Ligand binder design. Structure first.
Ligand code: NA
Length: 306
C-alpha cells in the first residue's frame, strides 16, 4: 500500500523496468515538484522512473548504479516512457555508472541535489559512512536524504555477520537501528526521523534460531540537511508550524514523520528541528512558521534539571 500518486505512476512504468527491480519500499517523498533527485542504486530504474514523474518536467533525476546490465535497462526505456507516458518533450533522467560510495568519482558536485533517495542497497555498502557522507556532500541546504532500508532492534552476533550465506536478502549487515542513527549523526545528519517502520516477519524458522530474539524492520528514514540548525535534542524556541494544505495528494494532513502529523491550517507547537525540517527545507513553501530562534526556552517537552 503506496500512496495513490506512487501507484498511479507505477501503473505506467515499463513492466521490464519493474520486474527487474527488487526493493523494500517506495521511498519517493511527496512534495518534490521541480526538484533534483539522486537515486542511489537505481538498478533497472523503477524508483527513478517514479521520481521522474513526480518531479514534473522541470525537475530531474539522476540514477547511479554499479551494474551495466541494470543501467542499460533503465536507459533503453527512458525516452519512450518520458514521451508517451509522461508526455514530456524528453527524458528528465540521467543514469550513470558508479559506486554509491564515490559520488565524487561519478562527477557529482557539492550541493547539486535536493533529495537523495535509496531503496535497500545501503546495507550492502562496504563503506556505509562514505555513502552517507557523500549524500550529505551532494545535498543542497534544506535538502533531504529520504530512503528505506532494513534494520534490527539489536546488534547481530559476529557469528551471524560475516557468515550468513546471503541470508534474508542483506539481513546480514542490517545494523542495530540506534547504531545507524549514530553513524548518520557523525556525518552531519544530527536528527534522523523515522517516517515509517514495518516489522519484517522472518518465518524461515531455521533462521529464527540463528538470530535469537532479533527483530528486523523495514524503515524509511528522513535525513534533512539544514546547516547550523539541526540539534541532537528537541530544543524549544517557542515556534509554531502550520501546514497550509498545499502538498499534492495531502490537502488534509501531512506526515513529516511518525511523531509529527500536521493537520491543514491547524497550528502546532514545535521544536527547532521540526521547525527547520518543514519550514527551512524544500518543504517550506507549504508551511508557515511563527516565531524564530532569537530566544531559547529550554528543552522542548521536558522540564529543566531532574
Ligand atoms: Na490528505
Amino acid at each position: 500500500a503506496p500512496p495513490p500518486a506512487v501507484r498511479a505512476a507505477l501503473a505506467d512504468v515499463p513492466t521490464e523496468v519493474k520486474e527487474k527491480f527488487w526493493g523494500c519500499g517506495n521511498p519517493i517523498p511527496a512534495g518534490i515538484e521541480g526538484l533534483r533527485v539522486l537515486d542511489l542504486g537505481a538498478g533497472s530504474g523503477r524508483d527513478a522512473y517514479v521520481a521522474a514523474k513526480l518531479v514534473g518536467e522541470k525537475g530531474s533525476v539522476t540514477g547511479v548504479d554499479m551494474t551495466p546490465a541494470q543501467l542499460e535497462v533503465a536507459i533503453s526505456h527512458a525516452d519512450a516512457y518520458a514521451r508517451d507516458k509522461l508526455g514530456y518533450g524528453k527524458s528528465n533522467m540521467t543514469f550513470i555508472q558508479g559506486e554509491i560510495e564515490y559520488l565524487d568519482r561519478a562527477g557529482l558536485e557539492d550541493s547539486s541535489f535536493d533529495l537523495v533517495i535509496s531503496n535497500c542497497v545501503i546495507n550492502l555498502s562496504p563503506d556505509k559512512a562514505r555513502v552517507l557522507s557523500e549524500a550529505y556532500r551532494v545535498l543542497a541546504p534544506g535538502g533531504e536524504m529520504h530512503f528505506s532500508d532494513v534494520y534490527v532492534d539489536r546488534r547481530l552476533p559476529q557469528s551471524v555477520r560475516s557468515h550468513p550465506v546471503l541470508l534474508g536478502e542483506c539481513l546480514a549487515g542490517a545494523l542495530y537501528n540506534n547504531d545507524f542513527i549514530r553513524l548518520a549523526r557523525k556525518v552531519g545528519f544530527t536528527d534522523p526521523r523515522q517516517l515509517e517502520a514495518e516489522e519484517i516477519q522472518i518465518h524461515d524458522a531455521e533462521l529464527r534460531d540463528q538470530v535469537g530474539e532479533a527483530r528486523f524492520y523495514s524503515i524509511t528514514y528522513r535525513l534533512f540537511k539544514v546547516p547550523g540548525q539541526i540539534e541532537d535534542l528537541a530544543e524549544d524556541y517557542g515556534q509554531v508550524a502550520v501546514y497550509k494544505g498545499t502538498i499534492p495528494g495531502h490537502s488534509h494532513a501531512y506526515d513529516l514523520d511518525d511523531h509529527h502529523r500536521f493537520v491543514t491550517n491547524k497550528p502546532m507547537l514545535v521544536a527547532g528541528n521540526t521547525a527547520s525540517m518543514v519550514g527551512e527545507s524544500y518543504l517550506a513553501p507549504h508551511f508557515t512558521i511563527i516565531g524564530d530562534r532569537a530566544v531559547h526556552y529550554g528543552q522542548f517537552d521536558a522540564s529543566g534539571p531532574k
